[PDB]
């Protein structure tokens, strides 16, 4: 039963004290039931609900320590607690915003098949409840039709500070796409457009990006020149190799009589 292991619920981890106790206590769960390939008598599922909530706080300690494979591994565990063959479970306060966090990292990690199985594993309830689903899926719509306009304005609406950690990863997939989508695809842009979109107005970060294009800047300008050289044609090589395809075409004249 184990009366309450979370006696310091608001004193989660200033150390690794309850993290070591958490490894021991999750191992006690592993000793006791095993996991959930069991039918259960629903009183051994009460400590499985406790196991859900302490794996939620283990996900919080995994994002506290930044162990992302253990974070997403415990997240896959909690999804298997919602893939748990009995839906008849008690209700936790994080029941949908855990799916929200999973959605946000799952969108940041550039997995779109994971995005559609996120919108397909439990489809019908994602529309109305949990604005931490709708604000991310309409935020995906904002990535679809008008990105680089609502990112900071969406960071301005997360009252539950666990989403800014993953939209920092979304800022990284913003900055690499700046690094692929404001130069070496255009003609020239001046310094103030890079000052607006590339914030903090002169770090070594936008300087890192401007030199990360493989390009040297002038004063108050960013040309996007010296690209798409020679007007390439591939002179006569398909003429050769497609006759080398005509070779096995003659082999297809050969295999039949």
């Amino acid at each position: 039963m184990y009366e309450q292991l979370k006696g310091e619920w608001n004193r989660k981890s200033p150390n690794l004290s309850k993290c070591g106790e958490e490894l021991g206590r999750l191992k006690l769960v592993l000793l006791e039931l095993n996991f959930l390939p069991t039918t259960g008598t629903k009183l051994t599922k009460q400590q499985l609900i406790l196991a859900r909530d302490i794996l939620e706080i283990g996900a919080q300690w995994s994002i506290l320590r930044k162990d992302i494979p253990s974070f997403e591994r415990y997240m896959a565990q909690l999804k298997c607690y919602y893939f748990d063959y009995k839906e008849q479970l008690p209700e936790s306060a994080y029941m949908h915003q855990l799916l929200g966090l999973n959605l946000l990292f799952l969108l940041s990690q550039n997995r779109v098949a994971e995005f559609h199985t996120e919108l397909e594993r439990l489809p019908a309830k994602d529309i109305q409840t949990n604005v931490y689903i709708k604000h991310p899926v309409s935020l995906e719509q904002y990535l679809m039709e008008g990105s680089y306009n609502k990112v900071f304005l969406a960071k301005g609406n997360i009252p539950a500070e666990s989403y800014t950690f993953f939209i920092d990863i979304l800022l990284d997939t913003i900055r690499d796409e700046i690094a692929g989508c404001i130069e070496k695809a255009y003609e020239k842009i001046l310094f103030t457009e890079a000052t607006r979109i590339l914030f903090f107005n002169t770090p070594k970060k936008m300087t890192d990006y401007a030199k990360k294009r493989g390009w040297v800047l002038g004063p108050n300008n960013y040309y996007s020149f010296a690209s798409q050289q020679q007007k390439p044609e591939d002179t006569t090589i398909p003429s050769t190799e497609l006759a080398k395809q005509v070779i096995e075409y003659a082999r297809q004249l050969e295999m039949i009589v």
Binding site: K27, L30, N34, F35, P37, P69, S70, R73, A76, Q77, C80
Partner: protein, 261 residues
């Protein structure tokens, strides 16, 4: 899925994890296809106990996929936990493939001068005489002789004719069978002469055996030695019918050469 959990250094989560694996293995066969390298690493850990059961479930999943041959090598390196099971559809398909490997191994090794052979592993040759023990339990003789020619070798072929109540009629049209089938003269005549050995082990002084190998394996001294058995025997049926068999059914050169011997 439930397999990435194994970052702990203690192995008891790995035994709990395989206790989960063999339990819910009936819905998750694709996940180990990403965990193939984890299977390899957990297999190559010696003091870690569950390398063998990893080899078991790796044979299971690669039998689902189609890697039946590394399933075969894993069944070999899956300990006695593999050989303890020989009653399933799984196990009959994989021992079919196993003694398939054994018989291609034996047909390859059988034409090598005195050695330099590929290592015939002990597990795939122990399940040979284990299946012969299953033949003895089933009491069946022709399945036993089928397995006895699967090895293409005299080891358990010697043991089918080492059994009790082996009727020499069935064992004699076994000569007919092996006469019309075996391609090379490398060991068809050796099967012939070991059967005439075991018929000289038969209590009746046999002469259909020497009557056949004398005109196939063409021995000039064996006809002289059964003639010395005639000198001992002093019958008149003894020097008559096998004499006629070689006298109208051997080479023109053969009897006219060997008659002075």
């Amino acid at each position: 899925g439930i397999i990435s959990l194994l970052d702990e250094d203690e192995p008891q989560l790995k035994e709990f994890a395989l206790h989960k694996l063999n339990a819910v293995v009936n819905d998750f066969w694709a996940e180990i296809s990403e965990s193939v390298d984890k299977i390899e690493v957990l297999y190559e850990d010696e003091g870690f106990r569950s390398r063998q059961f990893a080899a078991l479930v790796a044979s299971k999943v690669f039998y689902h996929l189609g890697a039946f041959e590394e399933s075969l090598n894993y069944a070999l390196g899956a300990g006695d936990l593999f050989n303890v099971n020989d009653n399933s559809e799984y196990v009959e398909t994989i021992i079919a493939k196993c003694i398939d490997h054994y018989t291609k191994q034996c047909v390859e090794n059988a034409d090598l001068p005195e050695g330099e052979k590929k290592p015939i592993d002990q597990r795939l040759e122990g399940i040979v005489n284990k299946m012969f023990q299953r033949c003895l339990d089933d009491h069946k003789y022709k399945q036993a002789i089928g397995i006895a020619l699967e090895t293409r070798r005299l080891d358990v072929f010697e043991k089918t004719i080492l059994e009790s109540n082996d009727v020499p009629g069935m064992l004699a049209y076994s000569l007919k069978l092996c006469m019309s089938l075996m391609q090379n003269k490398q060991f068809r005549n050796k099967v012939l002469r070991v059967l005439v050995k075991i018929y000289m082990n038969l209590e009746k002084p046999d002469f259909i055996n020497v009557c056949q190998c004398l005109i196939f394996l063409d021995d000039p001294q064996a006809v002289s030695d059964i003639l010395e058995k005639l000198v001992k025997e002093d019958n008149l049926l003894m020097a008559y019918q096998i004499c006629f068999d070689l006298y109208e059914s051997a080479s023109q050169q053969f009897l006219s050469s060997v008659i002075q011997n």
